[PDB]
């Protein structure tokens, strides 16, 4: 399974902070198997780590269409909107992450902070 | 757009002097989108920087079929033939680069030099 | 030929000990040209060097289906089974490597050692 081999090569680069090479491997995995939710998820993580928030959002949305139970993907999707100043969207995704995993202290903190910044009062 | 993402990954490696990895990313971009003139152009640049002149020529020819207005691609195609000792061809491509961008001092110098070396007098 | 270009990029990474990147390039070469015995062989070598013996076995089997005269591939297939403790299989593949190249001293030594360990006496 060359698609799974590429997903694994991508994970090894991602763990080492080699995000561009991780993205190349994940893209190759996704060209052979577009229904790999784990590869969409980690492709989104690599883009997030590079500061490419819009690209992270698009990859997390694909991962979530395939695996809606991935609590960490909802949390990371929330963080990508939070980084863009889209607080209403971040709140909604943090709440979904917390419905799935109530033990995510980072999701709790970020949700608390996004609620302070959500209002037109800035 | 995974093809554009690969073109961008290729540019990031190319800028850092990681030519082999740039070539992998450009090849993946070109397998998904063969009509990407920018990716053919930069694939030719990466091959040129590795000293692979024949491969640079083939990539520049594809880029130029798609984007004949790329003055820098005509200039680089001229340099790849110049590196092979094919002065008649270099002259022809430098003249085309200069018809498009008369302000390329490097194309002017290289054209001047290729004209000195063109003759059978060596 | 982009498939041959990927095989060459893979060899350049493999020679430098950049096994994960070599695997990415070989996979791309094999997606475009699955009948490239040299690319299956070197993909098996890269997996072997990473300690991924089962993956090396699968790649060597593909290389050997296409090029049964590759004496070094029979020898490396023998080493991958030897690393898994599968001595009967290692012996069989070392004997085939030695029928093709009787001058492989490493195959001779490894065959001699696998024969000592083959028995139920451990």
Residues C28, B28: C-beta atoms closer than 8 Å:
yes
Task: Tell me which chain A residues have a C-beta less than 8 angstroms from the C-beta of C21.
Answer: 21
In angstroms, what CA-CA distances link C79 with A60, B33, C54, C85? 42, 41, 11, 10
Chain A residue numbers touching B2 (CB-CB < 8 A): 27, 30-31
What is the rounded CA–CA span in Å between residue C1 and residue C21?
20
CB neighbour burial string for A18-40, b if at least 16 within 10 angstroms, e if fewer: bbbbbbbbbbbbbbbeeebbbbb
- Min distance B46 CA to chain A CA atoms (Å): 17
Sort B81 into a burial class: Cβ within 10 Å, 0-12 / 13-18 / 19+: buried
Tokens of B28: 């993946």
Q: Which residues of chain C neighbour A21 with C-beta distances below 8 Å?
A: 20-21, 24
- DSSP code string of C53-99: HHHHHHHHHHHHHH-TT-HHHHHHHHHHHHHTT-HHHHHHHHHHHHH
- Residues C63, C80: Cα–Cα separation, whole Å: 14
Candidate CATH numbers 3.40.190.290, 1.20.210.10, 1.10.10.10, 1.25.40.10; the one for domain C1-67: 1.25.40.10
DSSP state of C35: T
The Cα–Cα gap between B39 and C45 comes to: 31
For B89, residues 6+ apart whose C-beta sits below 8 A from its C-beta are B78, B81
Architecture of the domain defined by A68-122: Alpha Horseshoe (1.25)
Are domains B1-56 and B68-122 of this chain identical in fold? yes
CA distance B52 to B50: 6
Partners of A55 on chain B (C-beta within 8 Å) are 5
Q: Does A23 sit within 8 Å of B21, measured CB to CB?
A: no
Q: Domain B1-56 belongs to what topology?
A: 1.25.40
CA atoms within 13 A on the CB side of B113: 13
Say how many CB pairs under 8 Å bridge A and B. Answer: 24
Measured in angstroms, the CA of B19 and the nearest CA of chain C are apart by 10
CATH number 3.40.50.261 given to C71-122:
no
Q: With the CA atoms of B27, B31, B35 and B37 taken in that order, what torsion angle do they form, in degrees rounded to the nearest 10?
A: -10
Query: From B52, which residue of chain C is nearest by alpha-carbon distance?
Result: C5
B70: DSSP letter: -
> Is residue A59 a contact partner of residue A29, using CB atoms and an 8 Å limit?
no
Nearest CB neighbour to A27, from listed B6, B13, B21: B6
Domain A1-53: give its CATH superfamily: Tetratricopeptide repeat domain (1.25.40.10)
User: Beta-carbon neighbour count of residue C15 at 10 Å?
Assistant: 9
* 3 state SS of B90: helix
Q: C43 with C26: CB under 8 angstroms? A: yes
How far is residue C61's CA from residue B49's CA, in Å, rounded to a whole number?
37
3-state secondary structure B5-54: HHHHHHHHHHHCCCHHHHHHHHHHHHHHCCCCHHHHHHHHHHHHHCCCHH
Phi first, then psi, for residue A111 (nearest 5°) are -65, -45
Burial class, C33, CB count within 10 angstroms (exposed 0-12 / middle 13-18 / buried 19+): middle
Would you tell me how many other CB atoms lie within 10 Å of the CB of residue C17?
Answer: 9
Report the chain C residue with the minimal C-alpha distance to residue A4: C27
List CB contacts (< 8 A) between A12 and chain C: 20
């Amino acid at each position: 399974n060359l698609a799974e081999k590429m997903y694994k090569a991508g994970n090894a680069m991602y763990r080492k902070g080699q995000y561009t090479i991780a993205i190349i491997a994940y893209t190759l995995a996704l060209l052979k198997d577009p229904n790999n939710a784990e590869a969409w998820y980690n492709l989104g993580n690599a883009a997030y780590k590079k500061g490419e928030y819009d690209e992270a959002i698009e990859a997390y949305q694909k991962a979530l269409e395939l695996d809606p139970n991935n609590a960490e993907a909802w949390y990371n999707l929330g963080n990508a909107y939070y980084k863009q100043g889209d607080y209403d969207e971040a709140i909604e995704y943090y709440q979904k992450a917390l419905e799935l995993d109530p033990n995510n202290a980072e999701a709790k903190q970020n949700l608390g902070n996004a609620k302070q910044k959500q209002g037109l009062e800035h």
